[PDB]
Amino acid sequence: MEIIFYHPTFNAAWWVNALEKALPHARVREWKVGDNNPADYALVWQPPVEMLAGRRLKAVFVLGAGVDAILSKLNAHPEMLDASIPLFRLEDTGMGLQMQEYAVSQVLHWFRRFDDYQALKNQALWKPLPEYTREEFSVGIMGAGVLGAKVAESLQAWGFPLRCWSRSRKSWPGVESYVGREELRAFLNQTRVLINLLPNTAQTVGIINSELLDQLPDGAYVLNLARGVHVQEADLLAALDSGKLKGAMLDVFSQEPLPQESPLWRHPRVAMTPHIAAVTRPAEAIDYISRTITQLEKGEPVTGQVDRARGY
Amino acid sequence: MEIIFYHPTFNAAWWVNALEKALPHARVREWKVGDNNPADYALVWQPPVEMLAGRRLKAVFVLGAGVDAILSKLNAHPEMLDASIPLFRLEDTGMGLQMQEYAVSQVLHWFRRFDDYQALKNQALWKPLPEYTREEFSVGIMGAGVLGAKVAESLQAWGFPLRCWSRSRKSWPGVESYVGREELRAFLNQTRVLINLLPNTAQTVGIINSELLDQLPDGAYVLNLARGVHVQEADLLAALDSGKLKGAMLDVFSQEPLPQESPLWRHPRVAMTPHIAAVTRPAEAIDYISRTITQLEKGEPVTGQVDRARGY
Numbered sequence A, B: 001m002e003i004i005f006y007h008p009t010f011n012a013a014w015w016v017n018a019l020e021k022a023l024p025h026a027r028v029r030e031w032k033v034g035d036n037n038p039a040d041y042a043l044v045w046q047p048p049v050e051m052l053a054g055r056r057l058k059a060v061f062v063l064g065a066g067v068d069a070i071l072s073k074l075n076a077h078p079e080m081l082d083a084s085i086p087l088f089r090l091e092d093t094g095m096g097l098q099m100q101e102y103a104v105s106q107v108l109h110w111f112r113r114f115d116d117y118q119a120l121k122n123q124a125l126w127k128p129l130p131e132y133t134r135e136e137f138s139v140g141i142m143g144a145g146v147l148g149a150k151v152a153e154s155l156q157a158w159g160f161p162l163r164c165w166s167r168s169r170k171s172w173p174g175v176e177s178y179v180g181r182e183e184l185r186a187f188l189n190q191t192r193v194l195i196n197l198l199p200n201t202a203q204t205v206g207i208i209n210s211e212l213l214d215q216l217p218d219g220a221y222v223l224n225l226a227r228g229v230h231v232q233e234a235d236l237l238a239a240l241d242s243g244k245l246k247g248a249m250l251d252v253f254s255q256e257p258l259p260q261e262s263p264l265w266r267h268p269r270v271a272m273t274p275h276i277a278a279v280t281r282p283a284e285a286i287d288y289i290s291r292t293i294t295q296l297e298k299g300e301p302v303t304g305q306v307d308r309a310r311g312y
């Protein structure tokens, strides 16, 4: 079997060896312009259109959790991937734990008011502050998927009330599930820390704007771990300077890297990480990919399929 | 039984009431200057020497985990607490959870390099940084006690290699136990994050000095949650500037409130909070104090006693 691989930042050599080692029957190769020789599978991330264009592939594996990049290309260039070719993505593969680290650290940080204590420090002002109660510090997670579930589970253990928002009702003990645009307002109602783990789709783009930010309590927080398009950077800045939002932390942005122009860099109550929240562990990825290929060759059940109708 | 109470900031009326209702046969009163009447028990926190000096009591209950306020004064004023008067403190009473909150948030903060990332945000600079591995990010807890154990519990759960330092051997899961000054250098050797939860005694005053810091590995971190006297502040700053230490977070200091002319305030790699890490939960304190008093009256054994021979 032939396998092509493309990724603009990963070490192709490592993945080439790793996959061949996992699939002894296979011939894996790094793809690059001019490579129009046959292939059965493709492992990708930010692939050029000429790569998949008109190719007969049994499956395409996206090397991350998000598939918006490739789905937006497939929409502006429908000749890239034929609708018969199943698409896969990485579910967890170590990103679960990394999201739990980030979320638990930062939800605790705001709850203990370390953000204020750093403010007060920079002025050189010793000033104790009243504790927040747990009942007033609810955690709302938009996107209750593979990653949202891992996060909500790490926070539940700490006694914070938890709620989640998704398109389908979830029945997790110790968590309250809000569903669809009808319940979005309710979900935002008593949510203190807004955590975003939504996939970027035509249906979620820009969902965090002035309209959404008004439905949150004053002194609320925003932890954006999904994609930059989800938030209106000018509307975020305005909700902080007004007092609707106590603080925020962002790992993704409108444009990456973020240009120095951006006022986010200069605002003091905005923490920023350069799109590094969760990355796949290559060995766990190799395990999932090789197993799914084994199972696809045998016509047996598989996981991680992208439903292109829903768009994620 | 007559009980006297004193606390500088808590609401005396509330405690008097709670205690009389936890102990129906007690006549409880707030102590104030001029009160020379007899008492059987005293509940105190940072009490003036005149309150206990000379008194015949069945017991003194210190309203916190640390007893140095009292003890530190005994050399010069043995009169304050006749050697025959048993002294008690507050073991956990909800402080365990608060320490865990603090420690998990910040250890995770430094591990995910959230400190570099804010420095980077402050230089309008987009720079992903290398990930630290769990194996190089050992956590060392000096003072393996009521609170230190709680913190070890919460951190070993994240898979950080853990170690503790105390005067007796501890047997905890996922924790390496180090004991006495003979094993201190070994304890410090590969400790990346040093968390201090020691009690203030003559043996520990000044423990975190230039020489202890040299025994740490390079790029280490200091989390001081115990007493301000435990750290030689000037040596801390030297270690931070020479690179030995990457960062520090402090809740306690030489003088509290800390003078505005102290350079800790401006060192960008020194987070600080105004002695707010953990406080007792009144109902839990009342529960303990009342039950202990009842047991003492029946000639029954009790817990929470300060070993005046060891000094904590």
Ligand SMILES: NC(=O)C1=CN([C@@H]2O[C@H](COP(=O)(O)OP(=O)(O)OC[C@H]3O[C@@H](n4cnc5c(N)ncnc54)[C@H](OP(=O)(O)O)[C@@H]3O)[C@@H](O)[C@H]2O)C=CC1
Binding pocket: A065, A066, A067, A090, A091, A092, A095, A142, A143, A144, A145, A146, A147, A148, A165, A166, A167, A168, A169, A180, A197, A198, A199, A200, A201, A203, A204, A225, A226, A227, A251, A252, A275, A276, A277, A278, A279, A312
């Ligand atoms: N470093 C970083 O910043 C990283 C970011 N990510 C981001 O995390 C996202 C989440 O990944 P993962 O948890 O694996 O994905 P999942 O697909 O398993 O979860 C997505 C969740 O979003 C919900 N959802 C999708 N659209 C809507 C909508 N229109 N309204 C309400 N809910 C919606 C889904 O609902 P339902 O359950 O009902 O179908 C689902 O619960 C990725 O798509 C990616 O953008 C991922 C990894 C790293």
Ligand SMILES: NC(=O)C1=CN([C@@H]2O[C@H](COP(=O)(O)OP(=O)(O)OC[C@H]3O[C@@H](n4cnc5c(N)ncnc54)[C@H](OP(=O)(O)O)[C@@H]3O)[C@@H](O)[C@H]2O)C=CC1
Binding pocket: B065, B066, B067, B090, B091, B092, B095, B142, B143, B144, B145, B146, B147, B148, B165, B166, B167, B168, B169, B180, B197, B198, B199, B200, B201, B203, B204, B225, B226, B227, B251, B252, B275, B276, B277, B278, B279, B312
């Ligand atoms: N808000 C704040 O910043 C607060 C700070 N604290 C501080 O936390 C401290 C600890 O509280 P808690 O855990 O209840 O106290 P414990 O007395 O239960 O723990 C102290 C630990 O230190 C060890 N120890 C004492 N002396 C030495 C020494 N010379 N060498 C090595 N180890 C030593 C003891 O060893 P061993 O087990 O062998 O006896 C014990 O494990 C308090 O004294 C207080 O100062 C407490 C509450 C709040």
Ligand SMILES: C[N+](C)(CCO)CCCS(=O)(=O)O
Binding pocket: B035, B036, B037, B038, B039, B050, B051, B052, B053, B054, B055, B056, B057
């Ligand atoms: C000098 N006194 C009155 C100061 C009390 O702080 C000692 C009182 C003796 S007793 O009543 O406690 O047995």
Ligand SMILES: [Cl-]
Binding pocket: A009, A010, A011, A014, A282
């Ligand atoms: Cl790689």
Ligand SMILES: [Cl-]
Binding pocket: A064, A065, A066
């Ligand atoms: Cl992703």
Ligand SMILES: [Cl-]
Binding pocket: B010, B011, B014, B282
């Ligand atoms: Cl009170």
Ligand SMILES: [Cl-]
Binding pocket: B064, B065, B066
């Ligand atoms: Cl204390």
